[PDB]
């Protein structure tokens, strides 16, 4: 039904969400200290001496185990 | 149809997983320190001396803002 397509669509959109932010292709498992911004796989947080959302200056990165890993 | 049951029933299951282990009723928005276990909502979080996952030390919380935020 077109309920389907909404359904299909907010899944889509929830599991896109959980995606880096930079390379769209892996897990966000990392979070820039200390602002908290979690958006980032481990390889693009690596490469960022500022964070891409709020632009502080990245102290060091925190691996993070969420319950959806 | 069956299918849109299916899909309802993923969603669903995706959104549980995102709420706080202890009270179930608030977003996951804390990590605990070093461990890196990113399991409840700050309130929880906060009188937690141990890891509910692993048993490790929390030696802090630190606040995290995900995406998924809603
Ligand atoms: C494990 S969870 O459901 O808290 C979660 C939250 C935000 C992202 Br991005 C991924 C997983
Ligand atoms: C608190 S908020 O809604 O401004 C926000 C900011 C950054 C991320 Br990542 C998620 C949510
Ligand atoms: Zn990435
Ligand atoms: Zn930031
Ligand atoms: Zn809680
Ligand atoms: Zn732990």
Redesign the pocket.
């Known amino acids: 039904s077109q309920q389907t397509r909404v359904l299909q669509e907010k899944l889509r959109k929830l599991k896109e969400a959980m995606l880096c932010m930079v390379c769209c292709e892996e897990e966000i498992n990392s979070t820039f200290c200390p602002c908290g911004?979690?958006?980032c796989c481990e390889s693009c947080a690596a490469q960022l001496q500022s964070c891409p959302?709020?632009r502080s200056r990245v102290e060091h990165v925190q691996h993070v185990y969420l319950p959806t890993h």
Do not use: D, R, S
């Open positions: 911004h979690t958006v959302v709020c």
